[PDB]
Design a protein around this nucleic acid. Structure first.
Lengths: 154, 80, 126, 205, 96, 98
RNA sequence: CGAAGAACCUUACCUGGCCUUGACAUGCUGAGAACUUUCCAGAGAUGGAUUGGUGCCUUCGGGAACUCAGACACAGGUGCUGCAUGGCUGUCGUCAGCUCGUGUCGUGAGAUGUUGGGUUAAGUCCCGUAACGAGCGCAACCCUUGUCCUUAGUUACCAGCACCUCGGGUGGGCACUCUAAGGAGACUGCCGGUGACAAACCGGAGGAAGGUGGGGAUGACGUCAAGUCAUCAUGGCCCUUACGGCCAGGGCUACACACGUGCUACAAUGGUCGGUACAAAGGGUUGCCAAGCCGCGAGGUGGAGCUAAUCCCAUAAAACCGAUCGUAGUCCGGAUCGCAGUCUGCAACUCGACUGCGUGAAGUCGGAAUCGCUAGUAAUCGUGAAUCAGAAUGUCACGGUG
C-alpha cells in the first residue's frame, strides 16, 4: 500500500453563500439526482427560518456539534483475542460522521412531506433530544468500558 | 393472428378430399397429416384422423369447434 | 477592434463566446441567461470568472454554444470566457491561474470493455 | 498466446496482399473469387516454389503477380503454362486475367520458401534435427539477423508431442517497428501431422 | 470530384497527382476538402469451441476526399484517369 | 457435411427459378382495391407451388466452410474462417484498432 | 455457455413414407441439344402425362456441351479416439521473471553470473563484486483523448456585409466552429532541500497538460495428457441394401422439484396530467420508406427524397414548470387470465411479437452467508448496431446527470 490518495475539492453554493452546506448536500444526493436533493435541503432550510427567527445556518452549525462525537472504538484484533480500542477521532473525520448519522435517521422518521423529516432532525440537535444525539452519546459510553484497552494490547 | 384481410385458411388437397367426400357421405374417417388448417361450417360433423406425430387419432367434429384449428385436439406429449 | 473571440470545451460541448464593450448585455443563443438555464446553480457559475475579475458591468457578452449536456454547456462558457478575458493582457493571468479556471477539464467518459458490463463493473461469480 | 505477427503490423511494417476498393453490394463477390484463386494456384504450383500471390484490381479487369524463386519452370518454352492458365483463370474469375512473374533472389530469406523445404525433408524420412540444423545455418551465411524454427507434432514417437525449438541470433516480437516474416506449412507423414512455424527476422525499421 | 479508398497513404497522395496535373494545364482547381470517415467495428469470437470472454475486434476504414475545379476547360485529366487510379482508389466525377 | 451443402444448393435454384409469379400473386393480395374473387383463386396458385420457393426456407450458410451459425453478410465467411483469412493480409482495408 | 436469433427450414434425434454406383467425384457403355411443358394421381417424396425446343463448333466425319439408363472401382459418414496429433483459445499473470556463451570453483548432481547496499510500477537503474558478455521479457516503437500551429471551405460554417418572406432563407465571406492531413509540446527540463551528492526522493515555478497525463492493443520459458475429431485438417478403427441418401408431421420451448446469473418492483429524493430544454454514435438503391391521409392504438394508404456531412431512420430520456395524489396493499405494483385486433410468413395449434379492453396476485427493503468498485468511477436515464421474413430483460457499442 504505497500512499497515493490526493485531495479533490467541492465548494459551491451560490444561492446561499455557504461551504459546509454544499458538502452536506452531497450526502443527500442519490444516483446523481442533484437538483432534486438541492430543493429538499433548501426545503428543510426555510422551515427552520419559518420555525426559528435565527439564521438557519447557525441552527445547522449547532446541530452538527451535538451529533459529532469525540472518541470511538476500533476493533484491532491481536491475532488470538478480539479486542476493541477507544481511539481519538481525527478532526477532519468528525464532520462527516454527524452528517451521515443525520440523514440515515431522517429516512426512518416516518412522517409525510419528506423535507419535514429532515426539518425535525435539525431542530432536536440544538437541544439534545434527537435520535442522532442519543446515538452519539451511547457510543461515548462504549469507550469507558473499553478504556482498559486504551494502550495495553492496543 | 391471421388478420381479417386474409380471412380463411384451409388446405387445397384437404378441400377436394372433403367437399367431394360430402357428396358421398360419412362412411369413413379422413386420414390427414395436415394440422395447419381450421375447421369450417362446410365440415360440421365429420371424422378426421389427425396425425399425432406417430399415429392418427379420430376426431368427432361438433358445431362449436369452428374457430379452433385441428392442432388443439391431437396430443403431442404424454406426461403420465 | 474590440471584439474578442473566446472558445471553450468541457464534456463534448463547444461555446463560441464573443466579448466587446457594453452594458451588461448577456445573451445566449438569442435567449436571456435566466431563461436559458432553467432552475440551476450554474446560472451564477457563468458569472464566477466575470465577477472575480471585476468586469461584470463593463461588457457585452454574446454566446453561442452547441452540443454537450445541460450542465456541460455551462462549464464550456466558464472555460470559454476565461480565454476571452486573457486576450487583453496577463494582469488577470495570475488572478485566474491561482483561481483554477484556465485549465480545461480533461475528464472524459470511458469505453465499455469486453467481459465487463460497465466501464469497470463486472458480473458476480461465486 | 502470441497474436499473429502480421495482424499486429498491417501498417507500420507490411501491407496487404491484395488492394481493391469495392462497394457494399459487390464486396463479398470479389472475396470469393480471390480466395479460391489462391487455393487453385498453390495446388497447381506445388513445385516451382511460390511465396506471395498479389492481386490488384484496376479498372474492371484484374492483375496478378505470382512470385517464384524459379521462374523458368513456370515460364517454360515461352509461356506454355502462362497462356494455358490465363485461359483458365478466367473460368473461375470472369474478368480477363493478367499474370506477371518476378524472381525471389535469395530464396533462403522468405519464410514460405524455407518452410516448404522442411516438409519435403521430413517426408523423405530425414532426421528431425539434421534437417533443421542445416536449414538455419544456410539461412545465416547470407542475410538474416535472427531465425526461430519450431517443429511440433508427432516427431516419429509413439505418443509423443514434443517441440523442437532451435534459435540463432536476435528475434524481437513486441516491437512493432521491426520487420518479421511468418509462415506455417504442414506435413503429412506416414503417421501423424507435423506443423512447422518460421520466424525469419530481417532488418528493423 | 470525389474519391474513395482504404488508406490515407494512397488517397491523400493521389490528390497531388491530380491537383498538380490539372492546375498545370491552366484551369483553376481549389484545395481538396476532407469528409467524415466511415468506421465499422467487427467484434468476432476467437475460440473454436466455446470460451466466450476471449474476443477480438477489428475496424475497417474508408477515407473520402473531394476536389473542386473552378473553370472546366481541360479534358487532360479525362485521359489521365488510368494514371491517377493506382490500386484501390475510386473516382466519381463531379466537375463543378 | 457434404451431402448437406448439396441439398441447400438446389434450394437457391428453386427460389431464383420461379421468383416472379410469387411477386404477382403477392401483388394481387396486397391491394385493398382488389376483389376477393381475384384473391381467392390467387391463393390457389401459391399453395400448389412447391414450398421451397420462399426466402424463409433459404438459409445463408458460409460459402467456404458451410457452418450455419456465425455468418456475416458484409463478407461471405464464417466466424472462424474470417480470422484466419484476415491475419494473412487478404481482406483489404481490415486492421485492428481501438 | 458453442447459439451474432429452434413456427417448418436450420436439425443432427423421434414416427413413418422411400431410395441402392447413390444428392455429389473420376474413369466406362448407350441414349438424346439444353430447354419448355403451364396436367392429373398422391401428405409429399415421387410416378405418369406434357403443346412445344432441336441449338452450338463444323476435316461435315463428327466433336464438345448438357440430360437419361447400365455396370465397376467407388462415393459418403455430425460413427469411436482431444491420452495418436496439427491448428486455434482459456489459465496462472500483464505476474517480473526465465535461460545461454566463455571462464573459474566441486570426485560428482550442482553452483556462480542472476548474490550485497540504495532505489524502482520493473532482473528499472547506481555503487559494489571470479565472473565478462548476449538473448527473451519490462520500457519505448502503435492507437485514441486533451493544447497550439500550418494546408484545406461543400453538402459543413455565420463574426463582417447587404438581402429577406426574417428560415444562412439568399447573395456573400474563409473570421470561425467543425472535419482530417501534416506538425510542435513534457524531457525530472528548471528552482530549492534531501542521498555516497549516485542513482533517485520530497517540495517549487512556469505550463493546456508534471513526474510511466488518462485509456487501448501488446501477455516471456512454461504449467494443467485443461478444452475441441461437432468449425476445419489428419493417423487408425468400424458402417457401405445403410451407422449412408430423400419427404412429410413431432421434437429440442415437457415439469412436484434444486442451483446459477439478469430484470423489474416493494413507493411521497415518489405517482399521474398539462406544457417545455439540451446529446453522441451508427445504419439505409434488392433498401430507408417522408408530407398528406384514414385508425381508441399497434397501423393502413400514399409515394416523395435518396446512393449520401444533402434524403430518411429520428421524437433522446432523466432535469426543469404548473396541477392533483396524503404514505393506504395504495391513483403502489404489475404476474396471471377473458375478450377483441393488426404485422411478417405457404403456414402463428403444440410454438412468435406487439395493440385495445377487462380482471388484478405475490410483494411493506428481504436469514446464515456473499460479491463488484478508488473518479467522469460507482449509481441512475436513454440511444444505436450486429445476427435477422418475423422475434432481446442477453452481447457489443455511444452519450446525459453525477
Amino acid at each position: 500500500r504505497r500512499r497515493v490518495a490526493a485531495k479533490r475539492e467541492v465548494l459551491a453554493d451560490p444561492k446561499y453563500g455557504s461551504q459546509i452546506l454544499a458538502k452536506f448536500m452531497n450526502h443527500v444526493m442519490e444516483s446523481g439526482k442533484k437538483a432534486v436533493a438541492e430543493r429538499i435541503v433548501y426545503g428543510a432550510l426555510d422551515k427552520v427560518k419559518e420555525r426559528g427567527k435565527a439564521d438557519p445556518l447557525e441552527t445547522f452549525e449547532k446541530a452538527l456539534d451535538a451529533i459529532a462525537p469525540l472518541v470511538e472504538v476500533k476493533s484491532r484484533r491481536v491475532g488470538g483475542a478480539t479486542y476493541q480500542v477507544p481511539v481519538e477521532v481525527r478532526p477532519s473525520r468528525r464532520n462527516a460522521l454527524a452528517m451521515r448519522w443525520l440523514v440515515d435517521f431522517a429516512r426512518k422518521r416516518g412522517e409525510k412531506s419528506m423535507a419535514l423529516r429532515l426539518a425535525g432532525e435539525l431542530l432536536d440537535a440544538a437541544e439534545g433530544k434527537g435520535a442522532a444525539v442519543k446515538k452519539r452519546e451511547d457510543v461515548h459510553r462504549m469507550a469507558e468500558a473499553n478504556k482498559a484497552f486504551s494502550h495495553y494490547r492496543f | 393472428p391471421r388478420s381479417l384481410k386474409k380471412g380463411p385458411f384451409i388446405d387445397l388437397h384437404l378441400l377436394k378430399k372433403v367437399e367431394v367426400a360430402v357428396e358421398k357421405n360419412d362412411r369413413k374417417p379422413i386420414k390427414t397429416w395436415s394440422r395447419r388448417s381450421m375447421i369450417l361450417p362446410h365440415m360440421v360433423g365429420l371424422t378426421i384422423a389427425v396425425h399425432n406425430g406417430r399415429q392418427h387419432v379420430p376426431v368427432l367434429v361438433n358445431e362449436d369447434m369452428v374457430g379452433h384449428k385441428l392442432g388443439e385436439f391431437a396430443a403431442t406429449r404424454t406426461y403420465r | 477592434a474590440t471584439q474578442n473571440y473566446g472558445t471553450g470545451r468541457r464534456k463534448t460541448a463547444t461555446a463560441r463566446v464573443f466579448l466587446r464593450p457594453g452594458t451588461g448585455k448577456i445573451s445566449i443563443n438569442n435567449r436571456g441567461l435566466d431563461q436559458f438555464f432553467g432552475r440551476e446553480t450554474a446560472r451564477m457559475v457563468v458569472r464566477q470568472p466575470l465577477e472575480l475579475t471585476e468586469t461584470v458591468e463593463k461588457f457585452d457578452i454574446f454566446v453561442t454554444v452547441v452540443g454537450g449536456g445541460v450542465s456541460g454547456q455551462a462549464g464550456a462558457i466558464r472555460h470559454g470566457i476565461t480565454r476571452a478575458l486573457i486576450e487583453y493582457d496577463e494582469t488577470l493571468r495570475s488572478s485566474l491561474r491561482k483561481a483554477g479556471y484556465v485549465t480545461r477539464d480533461a475528464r472524459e467518459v470511458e469505453r465499455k470493455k469486453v467481459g465487463l458490463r460497465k466501464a469497470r463493473k463486472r458480473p458476480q461469480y461465486s | 498466446q502470441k497474436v499473429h505477427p502480421n495482424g499486429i503490423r498491417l501498417g507500420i511494417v507490411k501491407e496487404h496482399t491484395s488492394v481493391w476498393y469495392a462497394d457494399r453490394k459487390n464486396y463479398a463477390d470479389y472475396l470469393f473469387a480471390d480466395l479460391k484463386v489462391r487455393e487453385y494456384l498453390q495446388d497447381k504450383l506445388k513445385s516451382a516454389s511460390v511465396s506471395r500471390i498479389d492481386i490488384h484490381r484496376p479498372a474492371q479487369t484484374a492483375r496478378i503477380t505470382i512470385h517464384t524463386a524459379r521462374p523458368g519452370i513456370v515460364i517454360g518454352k515461352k509461356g506454355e503454362d502462362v497462356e494455358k492458365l490465363r485461359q483458365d483463370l478466367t473460368k473461375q474469375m470472369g474478368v480477363p486475367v493478367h499474370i506477371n512473374i518476378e524472381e525471389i533472389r535469395k530464396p533462403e530469406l522468405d519464410a514460405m520458401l524455407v518452410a516448404q523445404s522442411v516438409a519435403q525433408q521430413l517426408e523423405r524420412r530425414v532426421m528431425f534435427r539434421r534437417a533443421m540444423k542445416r536449414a538455419v545455418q544456410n539461412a545465416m551465411r547470407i542475410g538474416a539477423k535472427g531465425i526461430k524454427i519450431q517443429v511440433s507434432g508427432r516427431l516419429g514417437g509413439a505418443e509423443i508431442a514434443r517441440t523442437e525449438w532451435y534459435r540463432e541470433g536476435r528475434v524481437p516480437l513486441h516491437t512493432l517497428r521491426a520487420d518479421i516474416d511468418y509462415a506455417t506449412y504442414e506435413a503429412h507423414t506416414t503417421y501423424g501431422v507435423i506443423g512447422v512455424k518460421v520466424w525469419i527476422f530481417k532488418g528493423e525499421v | 470530384i470525389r474519391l474513395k479508398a482504404f488508406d490515407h497513404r494512397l488517397i491523400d497522395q493521389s490528390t497531388q497527382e491530380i491537383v498538380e496535373t490539372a492546375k498545370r494545364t491552366g484551369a483553376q482547381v481549389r484545395g481538396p476538402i476532407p469528409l467524415p470517415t466511415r468506421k465499422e467495428r467487427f467484434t468476432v469470437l476467437i475460440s473454436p469451441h466455446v470460451n466466450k470472454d476471449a474476443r477480438d475486434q477489428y475496424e475497417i476504414r474508408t477515407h473520402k476526399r473531394v476536389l473542386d475545379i473552378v473553370q472546366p476547360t481541360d479534358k487532360t485529366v479525362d485521359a489521365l484517369m488510368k494514371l491517377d487510379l493506382a490500386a484501390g482508389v475510386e473516382v466519381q466525377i463531379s466537375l463543378g | 457435411k457434404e451431402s448437406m451443402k448439396n441439398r441447400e444448393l438446389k434450394r437457391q435454384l428453386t427460389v431464383a427459378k420461379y421468383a416472379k409469379k410469387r411477386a404477382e400473386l403477392k401483388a394481387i393480395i396486397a391491394n385493398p382495391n382488389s376483389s376477393a374473387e381475384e384473391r381467392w383463386n390467387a391463393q390457389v396458385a401459391l399453395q400448389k407451388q412447391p414450398r421451397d420457393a420462399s426466402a424463409s426456407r433459404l438459409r445463408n450458410r458460409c460459402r467456404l466452410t458451410g457452418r450455419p451459425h456465425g455468418f456475416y453478410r458484409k463478407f461471405g465467411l464464417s466466424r472462424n474462417k474470417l480470422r484466419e483469412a484476415a491475419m494473412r493480409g487478404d481482406v483489404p482495408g481490415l486492421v485492428k484498432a481501438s
